[PDB]
Design a protein around this ligand. Sequence first.
Ligand SMILES: C[C@@H]1COCCN1c1cc(C2(S(C)(=O)=O)CC2)nc(-c2cccc3[nH]ccc23)n1
Length: 247
Amino acid sequence: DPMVTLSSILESIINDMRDLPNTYPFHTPVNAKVVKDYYKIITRPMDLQTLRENVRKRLYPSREEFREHLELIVKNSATYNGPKHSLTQISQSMLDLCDEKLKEKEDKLARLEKAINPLLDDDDQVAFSFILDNIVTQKMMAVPDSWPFHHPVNKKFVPDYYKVIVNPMDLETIRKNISKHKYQSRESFLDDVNLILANSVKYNGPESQYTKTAQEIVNVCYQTLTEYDEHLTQLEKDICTAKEAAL
Ligand SMILES: C[C@@H]1COCCN1c1cc(C2(S(C)(=O)=O)CC2)nc(-c2cccc3[nH]ccc23)n1
């Protein structure tokens, strides 16, 4: 079972990260009854124990989902402790080692990932994802003053954001989803794109300039999808055939 082999590789990387110097503060979850403001600042807690348990729950079908959770450890430290704090440097040493090990095992990991999910090797899925990523970076992120929507909100800087917005979305998250080939057609992609605009209506109001910018992001997405409609329709058809074939 390639998921078992993959999981064993990921656990071995966790073992190697745990062994780096001074890493213990990251081995287990932050104790929010000692660090009483932790959840007022951090939205997505992560640590090596939780990461290992998730590997064992078979939550990571690829390098990328694993690495994304590992990177939260660093991002959270950068936010809470500071970008140059020794704890943030220590967390970064873990991520650097992970990247070394993933580099070394890249061909084996690719083989396992494609055995787990054959669409990662499908040329139509890859071409479709490439087009979506170019729409995001060249059209959507090029909208003037679109920066509020480029990344997840950092609760440190907007402390009530996630009390209001419980289903957040942003363009970086969409790009990460594209890189993982989460979207097999425009319908699921547009659900996430529209969530950006819905969240702006809710948090900022329907007449806010933030919402006008978000509306422009959505409108240039529709305009560009319409321009590429013929090609995208063919890719979506061939992806469906590949999806059904893998059965
Ligand atoms: C709430 C507002 C409008 O609705 C969309 C998301 N918005 C963001 C997003 C971000 C992020 S950030 C830096 O937190 O990563 C994702 C890019 N920051 C700020 C922000 C931060 C600090 C002071 C501020 N004054 C006005 C906006 C603002 N607002």
